[PDB]
Every structure is written in C-alpha cells, then in structure tokens.
Design a protein around this ligand. Sequence first.
Ligand SMILES: O=C(Nc1ccc(F)cc1)c1cccs1
Ligand SMILES: O=C(Nc1ccc(F)cc1)c1cccs1
Lengths: 336, 333
Amino acid sequence: HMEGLAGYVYKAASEGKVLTLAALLLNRSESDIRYLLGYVSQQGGQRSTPLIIAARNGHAKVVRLLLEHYRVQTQQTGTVRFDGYVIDGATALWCAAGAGHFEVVKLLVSHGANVNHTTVTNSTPLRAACFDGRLDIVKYLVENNANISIANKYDNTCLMIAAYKGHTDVVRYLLEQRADPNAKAHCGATALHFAAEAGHIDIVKELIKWRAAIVVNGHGMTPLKVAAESCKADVVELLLSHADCDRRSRIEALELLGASFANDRENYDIIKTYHYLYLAMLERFQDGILEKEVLPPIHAYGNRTECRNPQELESIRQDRDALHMEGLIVRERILG
Amino acid sequence: HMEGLAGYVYKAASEGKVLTLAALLLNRSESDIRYLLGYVSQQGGQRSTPLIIAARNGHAKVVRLLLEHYRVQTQQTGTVRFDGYVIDGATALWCAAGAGHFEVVKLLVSHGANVNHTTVTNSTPLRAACFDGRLDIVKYLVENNANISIANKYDNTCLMIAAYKGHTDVVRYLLEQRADPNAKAHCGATALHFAAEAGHIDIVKELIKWRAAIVVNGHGMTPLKVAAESCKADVVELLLSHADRSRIEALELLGASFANDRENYDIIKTYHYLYLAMLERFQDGILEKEVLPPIHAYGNRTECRNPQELESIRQDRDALHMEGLIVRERILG
Ligand SMILES: O=C(Nc1ccc(F)cc1)c1cccs1
Ligand SMILES: O=C(Nc1ccc(F)cc1)c1cccs1
C-alpha cells in the first residue's frame, strides 16, 4: 500500500532532510497526508511518527515544517529508545527533552505542546530534563507552566532524581521555584536521602538552606545513616553539624561510617575505619556512659569480637587485618 | 651520659650519611660501639636501632659499614612505621623488604639475616615483599630459603596478599615456586576468594591452572559468590566455566549487585543476570524459591517469580533497581 510511501516520509524526517520531506508531501491529498504523517513506523525497537523521530533526533529544521504548514497534532505518543532502555508513551516533546534538543523543545511548546503529558512511568518532559540535568530545558518548561510537582509512578519527583544524578544547579533552581524538598517516594526516600547516598555535598547544603526536614527513610534509616553506610564521610559530618541526638543516634552514624570504610573494597581505608570507630567510643564514656551489646564471635570472622572499651579498640590500632574485620562485624550488628 | 652521641649516630644512620656515621664510631671501644649501635631510639611510637633505620630508609652504604666493619647483629628488632601502621618485631631485613630496598635486602641476608624471622603479627620479609609486590626481592628471598608457607597471625599466606593487592607477577612466581593455593585464613578465605573480591582476572586464571576453592571468605561463600557480590562480572563468568542451584545463585547475586553497587552500577546488567538466572526456582514443591513478602523498604514490589514477570519490568529504571535490592537481601541479609 502507501505503507511504502510512509517509509520514505519517516526516513526523511528521522535524518532531517527538510528538502526531501517537502518534496514527498507536496502534492498530497489531506486524507493521504494524515496517513503519511500519522503512520506508526517500526524501526528497531521504536514505534514512532515522523514528528516524534524528528524531535528525538533534534532536527528542528524538520519539526518546524510539520507544525507550521502541515499542522501536525503535537499530542502524538510512541515508544522510542533512549540509550538502552525502551520508553513507551513518549511524546515528541518528551523525546526532545530527554535528548536535550534545546530548539525542538522551544518550538513544540511554543506551538502549543502539552508540557505535562507523561510516559507510562509518568515521567514528564521536565523530569527527563531533570534526569539529564539540562538546565536550559528545566528553566524553559517551568516558566512555560510545567508542573514541577507531578512525579513518576514511584512518587520519585524531578527534585529527587536531580539530586541522585547530582545536578547541583538544576536542584537549586527547583528549590527556588519552591519545589517541596520533603516529598517521599514509594521507597520512602527524600530528596536528601538520595543526595546523601551519592554524596552530593553541595546539593545536601542547598536542600538544608531551603528548610528541608529530617525524616526517617520511611522504610529504613535517616539521611545521615544512608550517608554513613554509603561511606560519604564529608556528607556524614555536614549533617552532624545540624540537630542530632546528643550521643545516641549521633554515635551510631560514626560507628557505621567507620564500619563502611572497612567493608567495601572500593574506598577501603582501615585508618579511618579506626578513626571514626574510636571517636565513637570517646563519645560513649565522656561524662556520666553508654556501652554496646556485642554479638558472639561468630565462627566466620575468625573469633574476633567487637570492642567494648576504648583501650580495647586502641590495642588494634596496629593491626590492619583485625581492624578490617572489626569493621565487618561492627557493620553486621547494625545491619543484620 | 653518652646518650647524646648515641642520638647523633642514629641521625647519621637514618639520613644515610655513611661518612658522618663512620666519623662518630671510629675511636670508640667495642663496649661503646655496642651502646651507640644498640640504642633503641623513640621517635613517636617507634623503637629503632641505627641499623634498622638504615635499612628502612634503604641507605645501603651505611648498612654495609655497619655489618662489615662494626659487625652489628642482624637479630636486632624494633617497632617501625610504614603505610601508617606501627609494626612491632621488625628487623632491618623485614623493613628493607616492605620498603622494596633491593640492595639492603641483598646486603643483610649475605651477612646472615634470618629470612624467616616474623613480626609480632608473624609477617615474613617474604610476606612484606609480597604485599608491596616487589618481584626482585620476592625471588631473592625465596632463593635464599624463605618459607612461602609461614603466614600471618590469621593464616594469611604470601599467596593471599599477592592476590588481594593484585601482583600478578608475584602470584605467578609463588605458584611456580609451588605455593599452596588451597590454604585458608581464619576467615576461611582462600587465595581465590581474595582475587575474586578485587576481580584480579589475570590472577584468577593463574590460580585456576592449579587450585580448587572451598567455601567461606568470612560469610560462607564460594569464590564465585564473592565475585558476584563484589559485582566482578568478568571474574564471575571465568569461574562460571566449571562445575555447577549454585549457578543460579551466582547469576542472581551478580545481577542483584549491579543495582545497589553505586560504584559499578548498571541497571541494564541487573536485568540480564537476573533474567538468565530464571530457569528453575519458584513454581515447584524447577525447584523451590521462597520470596520475601513485600517489605516497606524496596517499596512494596515483590520479587519476580516467573520469567514473564521480569519481562514486563525489562523497562523502568526505578523498578529494576529495587528488584536488585530484593534479590540481594534474599541471598544475604
Ligand atoms: O527521564 C527519564 N529517563 C531518561 C530519558 C532520556 C534520557 F536521555 C535520560 C534519562 C526517566 C526516569 C524515570 C522514568 S523516565
Ligand atoms: O603487609 C605488611 N606490611 C607492609 C605492607 C606494605 C608495605 F608497603 C610495607 C609493609 C604486613 C606487616 C605485618 C603483617 S602484613
């Protein structure tokens, strides 16, 4: 059928050949043009229309022709491919936003594109831009009345995803536009919880400057202890210079922070494994005191047992091997 | 007393001023030279002798003078500092081996240094040299009757530390010199367990030419599952070219490790080892798969029980990440 002629209009659109597109559409009845420009084309794992592919591929030159003259409906959705993950429900705007195609975004929403249509995971074009941290498209959409509040399937908001990937400038912009830094995901994670795991220290300070609230990971820990278990030490101390827990919860972070300098081989430093573990014990006998029930030796980590006295952990300051597994068991008593 | 001139000969020894050291000792009775050369000097928490520092600092010219003329006893031990750890029981030879001082090692053993003296932790000079991976001193000491077998307090053999720090050349020399590849530490960990943890693929094949590894690296693991949790995929697949349930646990834990592992995190590779893992645990009783109830943590998603379930989730980054955390907690805890 004219299914072959659709392949040609898709090919010209995907590769940005304005000259080819116009010559292909020039002498066509309106019935046929709506078929040609609305044809869902199977190319790889992408179900697309000429406009969606033209936008995903950043051929603004081609996108202009279709929206101005041939007046193509901007609400068309398809299933497109971004890197290695297939996304279904993607509109020309969402493809143009995720792929960071500056001009194409500005052209579609200027010609009336619904900036708040969502994929099946309910990622807005703004979220795509927040994931990749393209500041110009994040600024553009919000001042074009995009909804910073609409979040993904798992309540993971643009502010949360901007923090995990660490787009400091984008994160502060949304905070200024008064995005809620206390939203919670299906995980329970706050935007802070996320920035803590990835140690985006400047983002952590930005969120606090914008009256962010400390709340337990609804399904686990505090943002402090996710910093500790993630071993991001500078972050761990930042948060320990804001309202903490006297000795109690505060020392629990230090214990786990020093325990995380031990257990992961990537950033393993037994010197700071001891450094934090010892200072935790210091903050446990100050004035008054507060001890630890330790677990049996557990035939596994040899027969090492967790230290109960400062002098005890002092002894091991010469032994790498023992301090390393002292950390492995420190960690295992809080997590397990 | 003569404590002031003793301080001076230590200074000359540590800084390698052979001529200066010699100028201090020449018109001294043999009684006095033993005080000067036997003084244990405290710098920090360090107990040192002029000979030990000359060896720790690799000043061969000074070490020759001391052993040759003034005939200083090679026995003599002290407490020295290295990578940041104060080590007790260190002899001039052991210091020179950790510090990779080629000649000073060659000079000390020639005048009778016990190549098998052990620190307080029972570290051979061979172990020290194996940690630093200096192959020339590893061969030299071995060809002068060093015992590849004498291990640290925790049964950690020279082969283990050569694997952990990843000195392929030291590992292959030790294996060719016929080191035991099946020793176990107090953890239970074999040399492979260590090579897997750090993913030293070339060494892992080297041990394969010989070995055969049991269980536990500290938590009841085979070297395969230590590779999986460490996310070392290439190692996991190398080791997956041998003999067997155990197969599915490795793939599951490796793919579950690509999620939580922010260091080498790839959500695509989570959905790959987890998908290929789905062969035969779930819907029988194939074999038995007890899934955990959807606990408030990884949201309330529940672990996939059928191949078809994991196919739907082939897309969605958010969803596959919590699928890894769920598998991880089921195999671990
Ligand atoms: O926006 C997202 N993912 C994305 C798309 C395109 C791209 F280039 C980079 C990232 C999403 C996050 C959660 C659901 S969708
Ligand atoms: O590994 C050891 N010592 C060492 C390591 C690296 C180095 F550069 C210098 C010395 C050990 C000392 C006691 C037991 S093991």
